[PDB]
Design an enzyme around this catalytic site. Structure first.
Site, PDB file in Angstrom:
ATOM      1  N   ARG A  19       0.811  -1.219   0.000  1.00 55.13           N
ATOM      2  CA  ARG A  19       0.000   0.000   0.000  1.00 55.13           C
ATOM      3  C   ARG A  19       0.851   1.278   0.000  1.00 55.13           C
ATOM      4  O   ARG A  19       0.349   2.338  -0.404  1.00 55.13           O
ATOM      5  CB  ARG A  19      -0.961   0.022   1.204  1.00 55.13           C
ATOM      6  CG  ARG A  19      -0.270  -0.045   2.562  1.00 55.13           C
ATOM      7  CD  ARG A  19      -1.238   0.070   3.775  1.00 55.13           C
ATOM      8  NE  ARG A  19      -0.415  -0.061   4.976  1.00 55.13           N
ATOM      9  CZ  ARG A  19      -0.007  -1.219   5.490  1.00 55.13           C
ATOM     10  NH1 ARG A  19      -0.423  -2.379   4.968  1.00 55.13           N
ATOM     11  NH2 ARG A  19       0.799  -1.220   6.542  1.00 55.13           N
ATOM     12  N   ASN A  20       2.119   1.188   0.446  1.00 58.46           N
ATOM     13  CA  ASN A  20       3.022   2.361   0.468  1.00 58.46           C
ATOM     14  C   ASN A  20       4.052   2.406  -0.669  1.00 58.46           C
ATOM     15  O   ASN A  20       4.962   3.230  -0.649  1.00 58.46           O
ATOM     16  CB  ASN A  20       3.761   2.450   1.800  1.00 58.46           C
ATOM     17  CG  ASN A  20       2.915   3.104   2.903  1.00 58.46           C
ATOM     18  OD1 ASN A  20       2.144   4.032   2.651  1.00 58.46           O
ATOM     19  ND2 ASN A  20       3.069   2.618   4.123  1.00 58.46           N
ATOM     20  N   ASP A  59       5.657   6.798   1.658  1.00 64.31           N
ATOM     21  CA  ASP A  59       4.974   6.600   2.938  1.00 64.31           C
ATOM     22  C   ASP A  59       3.737   7.517   3.029  1.00 64.31           C
ATOM     23  O   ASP A  59       3.875   8.718   3.265  1.00 64.31           O
ATOM     24  CB  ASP A  59       5.950   6.858   4.098  1.00 64.31           C
ATOM     25  CG  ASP A  59       5.337   6.597   5.469  1.00 64.31           C
ATOM     26  OD1 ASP A  59       4.125   6.279   5.566  1.00 64.31           O
ATOM     27  OD2 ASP A  59       6.080   6.734   6.470  1.00 64.31           O
TER      28      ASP A  59
HETATM   29  O1  LIG Z   1       5.906   9.351   0.522  1.00 68.22           O
HETATM   30  C1  LIG Z   1       6.010  10.142   1.455  1.00 68.22           C
HETATM   31  N1  LIG Z   1       5.086  11.158   1.636  1.00 68.22           N
HETATM   32  C2  LIG Z   1       3.944  11.312   0.712  1.00 68.22           C
HETATM   33  C3  LIG Z   1       4.251  12.110  -0.561  1.00 68.22           C
HETATM   34  C4  LIG Z   1       4.543  13.568  -0.151  1.00 68.22           C
HETATM   35  C5  LIG Z   1       4.747  14.441  -1.383  1.00 68.22           C
HETATM   36  C6  LIG Z   1       3.480  14.392  -2.254  1.00 68.22           C
HETATM   37  C7  LIG Z   1       3.175  12.960  -2.696  1.00 68.22           C
HETATM   38  C8  LIG Z   1       3.009  12.012  -1.492  1.00 68.22           C
HETATM   39  C9  LIG Z   1       2.828  10.521  -1.917  1.00 68.22           C
HETATM   40  C10 LIG Z   1       1.745  10.245  -3.005  1.00 68.22           C
HETATM   41  O2  LIG Z   1       2.411  10.447  -4.244  1.00 68.22           O
HETATM   42  C11 LIG Z   1       1.798  10.153  -5.431  1.00 68.22           C
HETATM   43  C12 LIG Z   1       0.485   9.644  -5.320  1.00 68.22           C
HETATM   44  C13 LIG Z   1      -0.169   9.293  -6.492  1.00 68.22           C
HETATM   45  C14 LIG Z   1       0.494   9.462  -7.737  1.00 68.22           C
HETATM   46  N2  LIG Z   1       1.748   9.963  -7.849  1.00 68.22           N
HETATM   47  C15 LIG Z   1       2.389  10.303  -6.708  1.00 68.22           C
HETATM   48  C16 LIG Z   1       7.117  10.047   2.453  1.00 68.22           C
HETATM   49  C17 LIG Z   1       7.036  10.750   3.655  1.00 68.22           C
HETATM   50  C18 LIG Z   1       8.044  10.605   4.628  1.00 68.22           C
HETATM   51  C19 LIG Z   1       9.139   9.758   4.409  1.00 68.22           C
HETATM   52  C20 LIG Z   1       9.219   9.064   3.193  1.00 68.22           C
HETATM   53  O3  LIG Z   1      10.303   8.218   2.851  1.00 68.22           O
HETATM   54  C21 LIG Z   1      10.074   6.882   2.766  1.00 68.22           C
HETATM   55  F1  LIG Z   1       9.170   6.533   1.889  1.00 68.22           F
HETATM   56  F2  LIG Z   1      11.228   6.264   2.478  1.00 68.22           F
HETATM   57  F3  LIG Z   1       9.625   6.449   3.930  1.00 68.22           F
HETATM   58  C22 LIG Z   1       8.206   9.199   2.192  1.00 68.22           C
END
Ligand SMILES: O=C(NC[C@@H]1CCCC[C@H]1CCOc1cccnc1)c1cccc(OC(F)(F)F)c1
Ligand SMILES: [Cl-]
Length: 284
Positions: free
Chosen positions: A141-142, A155
């Site tokens: 899911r992540n 995440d």
């Molecule tokens: O992923 C993290 N935050 C969310 C991110 C924030 C920015 C805008 C997009 C959004 C995700 C959805 O993105 C999409 C969705 C759909 C289509 N395209 C893109 C995050 C946060 C903290 C640590 C981290 O590091 C690791 F993952 F290693 F934990 C990763």
């Protein structure tokens, strides 16, 4: 940095605890699609704080198979985070819409492509381990999916209603993805690279199931928590996720090593990646 005026909001991708995500067009970079997180309309002081820390955490991460921060907005604009648009959404929904190809005779996916997907996740986690960065909530899911089955670990946090059943909630306590959690995590509440290996084992199980079932799906939350106890007491009554149909025995024995009682006996991400990229190819 980047001016909020230069963005063209187009649609809504999702809602988070302290932000919301939009698909945006950029005309003058330096028809380009990007994903942009901004504060929710009811933005609180505590939410702005968590948003700014998210930007700081994300700014550490630079690898082909980890989400990357393409930019943030100019200071006096309303806050924003910009990243690549991953057009096939999260890996769990994506794999759910495929089934294993029938080599004898709806889109499909082959075993080697599943290996390819798993290997990219392993490589992303390899990178995180070199930073001593602990993910704490790895699961399909992540993960995000781009063009050509490219995968990037992200995440989303633990608030999406779609995956509410994946998290165990008790008033006043941290929210826990218990079905992905190593036994020491459930009992003592603390997370390490070794517990990330354990979660990777579960995630690999997911991929090989094509996300058609929840881990320990016929057991309750309480039974899953009590299973952690059986790992602790070590009297051979603990249970494991079963071999998926798409999974050959050699690959399943590697999954099982990810759930070794002793953290030290769990395989490092370097070895998991090597197996998935090479060794698993003679089992095809
Ligand atoms: O992923 C993290 N935050 C969310 C991110 C924030 C920015 C805008 C997009 C959004 C995700 C959805 O993105 C999409 C969705 C759909 C289509 N395209 C893109 C995050 C946060 C903290 C640590 C981290 O590091 C690791 F993952 F290693 F934990 C990763
Ligand atoms: Cl979000």
């Amino acid at each position: 940095d980047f001016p909020r005026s230069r963005l063209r909001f187009k649609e809504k991708l999702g809602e988070g605890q302290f932000g919301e995500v939009h698909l945006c067009e950029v005309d003058s970079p330096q028809p380009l699609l990007v994903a942009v997180k901004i504060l929710r309309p009811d933005a609180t002081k505590n939410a702005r704080n968590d948003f700014l820390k998210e930007v700081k955490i994300m700014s550490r991460l630079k690898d082909p198979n980890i989400i990357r921060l393409l930019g943030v907005c100019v200071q006096d604009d309303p806050l924003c985070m910009i990243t690549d648009y991953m057009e096939n959404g999260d890996l769990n929904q994506f794999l759910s819409a495929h089934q294993l190809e029938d080599k004898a005779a709806d889109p499909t996916i082959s075993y080697p492509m599943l290996l390819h997907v798993a290997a990219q996740i392993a490589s992303g986690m390899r990178y995180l381990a070199t930073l001593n960065f602990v993910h704490r909530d790895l699961a399909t899911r992540n993960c995000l999916v781009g063009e050509n089955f490219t995968i990037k670990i992200a995440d989303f946090g633990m608030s999406r209603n779609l995956y509410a059943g994946d998290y165990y909630r008790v008033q006043g306590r941290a929210v826990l993805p218990i079905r992905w959690m190593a036994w020491e995590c459930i009992l003592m509440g603390k997370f390490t690279t070794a517990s990330d290996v354990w979660a990777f084992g579960v995630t690999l199980w997911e991929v090989l199931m094509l996300c058609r079932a929840q881990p320990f799906g016929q057991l309750t939350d309480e039974q899953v928590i009590e299973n952690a106890g059986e790992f602790f007491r070590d009297q051979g009554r603990q249970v494991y996720l079963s071999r998926p149909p798409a999974c050959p025995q050699g690959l399943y024995e590697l999954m099982l090593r990810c759930w070794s009682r002793e953290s030290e006996q769990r395989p490092p991400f370097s070895q998991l990646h090597r197996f998935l990229a090479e060794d698993a190819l003679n089992t095809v």
